[PDB]
Design an enzyme around this catalytic site. Structure first.
Site, PDB file in Angstrom:
ATOM      1  N   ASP A 188       0.775  -1.228   0.000  1.00 24.77           N
ATOM      2  CA  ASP A 188       0.000   0.000   0.000  1.00 24.77           C
ATOM      3  C   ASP A 188       0.820   1.299   0.000  1.00 24.77           C
ATOM      4  OD1 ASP A 188       0.834  -0.120   2.602  1.00 24.77           O
ATOM      5  OD2 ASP A 188      -1.187  -0.421   3.427  1.00 24.77           O
ATOM      6  N   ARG A 232       0.852   6.780   0.137  1.00 21.10           N
ATOM      7  CA  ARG A 232       0.073   5.803   0.877  1.00 21.10           C
ATOM      8  C   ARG A 232      -1.323   5.756   0.267  1.00 21.10           C
ATOM      9  NH1 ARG A 232      -2.944   2.532   3.172  1.00 21.10           N
ATOM     10  NH2 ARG A 232      -2.484   1.640   5.228  1.00 21.10           N
ATOM     11  N   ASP A 251      -5.696  -1.287   3.562  1.00 22.04           N
ATOM     12  CA  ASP A 251      -4.640  -1.787   4.398  1.00 22.04           C
ATOM     13  C   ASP A 251      -4.177  -3.108   3.840  1.00 22.04           C
ATOM     14  OD1 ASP A 251      -2.927  -1.447   6.731  1.00 22.04           O
ATOM     15  OD2 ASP A 251      -4.089  -3.034   7.661  1.00 22.04           O
ATOM     16  N   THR A 252      -2.972  -3.142   3.340  1.00 24.42           N
ATOM     17  CA  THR A 252      -2.362  -4.417   3.002  1.00 24.42           C
ATOM     18  C   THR A 252      -1.609  -4.987   4.205  1.00 24.42           C
ATOM     19  OG1 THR A 252      -0.499  -3.164   2.006  1.00 24.42           O
ATOM     20  CG2 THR A 252      -2.201  -4.058   0.562  1.00 24.42           C
ATOM     21  N   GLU A 312       1.639  -6.271   6.006  1.00 21.88           N
ATOM     22  CA  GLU A 312       3.036  -5.876   5.886  1.00 21.88           C
ATOM     23  C   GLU A 312       3.699  -7.058   5.230  1.00 21.88           C
ATOM     24  OE1 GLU A 312       4.286  -2.817   6.984  1.00 21.88           O
ATOM     25  OE2 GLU A 312       2.315  -2.207   7.716  1.00 21.88           O
ATOM     26  N   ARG A 317       3.738  10.975   3.988  1.00 21.03           N
ATOM     27  CA  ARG A 317       3.319  10.232   2.819  1.00 21.03           C
ATOM     28  C   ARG A 317       2.164  10.974   2.191  1.00 21.03           C
ATOM     29  NH1 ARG A 317       2.521   4.434   5.601  1.00 21.03           N
ATOM     30  NH2 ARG A 317       0.928   5.781   6.497  1.00 21.03           N
TER      31      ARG A 317
HETATM   32  C1  LIG Z   1      -4.373   5.201   5.093  1.00 20.63           C
HETATM   33  C2  LIG Z   1      -4.031   6.279   6.089  1.00 20.63           C
HETATM   34  C3  LIG Z   1      -3.133   6.045   7.130  1.00 20.63           C
HETATM   35  N1  LIG Z   1      -2.856   7.029   8.007  1.00 20.63           N
HETATM   36  C4  LIG Z   1      -1.946   6.811   9.123  1.00 20.63           C
HETATM   37  C5  LIG Z   1      -2.763   6.291  10.292  1.00 20.63           C
HETATM   38  C6  LIG Z   1      -1.892   5.225  10.919  1.00 20.63           C
HETATM   39  O1  LIG Z   1      -1.314   5.765  12.131  1.00 20.63           O
HETATM   40  P1  LIG Z   1      -0.339   4.891  13.100  1.00 20.63           P
HETATM   41  O2  LIG Z   1       1.037   4.683  12.500  1.00 20.63           O
HETATM   42  O3  LIG Z   1      -0.394   5.861  14.254  1.00 20.63           O
HETATM   43  O4  LIG Z   1      -0.974   3.549  13.274  1.00 20.63           O
HETATM   44  C7  LIG Z   1      -0.861   4.866   9.845  1.00 20.63           C
HETATM   45  C8  LIG Z   1      -1.032   3.477   9.257  1.00 20.63           C
HETATM   46  O5  LIG Z   1      -0.406   3.365   7.992  1.00 20.63           O
HETATM   47  P2  LIG Z   1       0.274   1.971   7.607  1.00 20.63           P
HETATM   48  O6  LIG Z   1      -0.847   0.981   7.425  1.00 20.63           O
HETATM   49  O7  LIG Z   1       1.008   2.245   6.325  1.00 20.63           O
HETATM   50  O8  LIG Z   1       1.172   1.690   8.777  1.00 20.63           O
HETATM   51  O9  LIG Z   1      -1.020   5.780   8.801  1.00 20.63           O
HETATM   52  C9  LIG Z   1      -3.470   8.284   7.891  1.00 20.63           C
HETATM   53  O10 LIG Z   1      -3.160   9.147   8.741  1.00 20.63           O
HETATM   54  N2  LIG Z   1      -4.350   8.556   6.913  1.00 20.63           N
HETATM   55  C10 LIG Z   1      -4.664   7.620   6.000  1.00 20.63           C
HETATM   56  O11 LIG Z   1      -5.464   7.855   5.070  1.00 20.63           O
HETATM   57 CA   LIG Z   2      -0.162  -1.824   5.888  1.00 25.54          CA
END
Ligand SMILES: Cc1cn([C@H]2C[C@H](OP(=O)(O)O)[C@@H](COP(=O)(O)O)O2)c(=O)[nH]c1=O
Ligand SMILES: [Ca+2]
EC number: 3.1.31.1
Length: 129
Positions: A15, A29, A34-35, A37, A75
């Site tokens: 993702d 991103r 959510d993929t 990891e 991102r």
């Molecule tokens: C998809 C997405 C993730 N995020 C943030 C929330 C998550 O916070 P935390 O790191 O505090 O969990 C994190 C998860 O992304 P990843 O799934 O790439 O880790 O990315 C956003 O802020 N907005 C979004 O649209």
């Molecule tokens: Ca992920």
């Protein structure tokens, strides 16, 4: 919502993808998904799916939603299209991703991806098998 041009710099995982956008390098991103990891189940498959998709596209486009365009880690948050086909949707349809991180004002394509997930669940695909 509208599509803007960008070029592959580098596939990263299920993702996230590195693209050049308005002439700057930048990690994107994928909105609303959510993929797993890479180190998790279907992580590798997810990564390969997106990798193949973006590497083979003649044309990568980037589509911001109405809300926040950058996340707290810097991102870019967008829908990403590979020759007109949305990667976000494609992952969900194949059960390589779940609909997730649905925040208000950055949720235009929400129902479209839920439709896709529902069909992937129905077919017991990948994540759902
Ligand atoms: C998809 C997405 C993730 N995020 C943030 C929330 C998550 O916070 P935390 O790191 O505090 O969990 C994190 C998860 O992304 P990843 O799934 O790439 O880790 O990315 C956003 O802020 N907005 C979004 O649209
Ligand atoms: Ca992920």
């Amino acid at each position: 919502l509208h599509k803007e041009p960008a070029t592959l710099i580098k596939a990263i995982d299920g993702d996230t993808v590195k693209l050049m956008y308005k002439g700057q390098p930048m990690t994107f991103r994928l909105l609303l998904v959510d993929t797993p990891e890479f180190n998790e189940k279907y992580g590798p498959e997810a990564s390969a799916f997106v990798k193949k998709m973006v590497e083979n596209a003649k044309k990568i486009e980037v589509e911001f939603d109405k809300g926040q365009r950058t996340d707290k880690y810097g991102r870019g948050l967008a829908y990403i299209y590979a020759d007109g086909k949305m990667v976000n949707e494609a992952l969900v349809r194949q059960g390589l991703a779940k609909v997730a991180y649905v925040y208000k004002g950055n949720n235009t394509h929400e129902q479209l991806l839920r439709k896709a997930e529902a069909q992937a669940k129905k077919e017991k695909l990948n994540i759902w098998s």
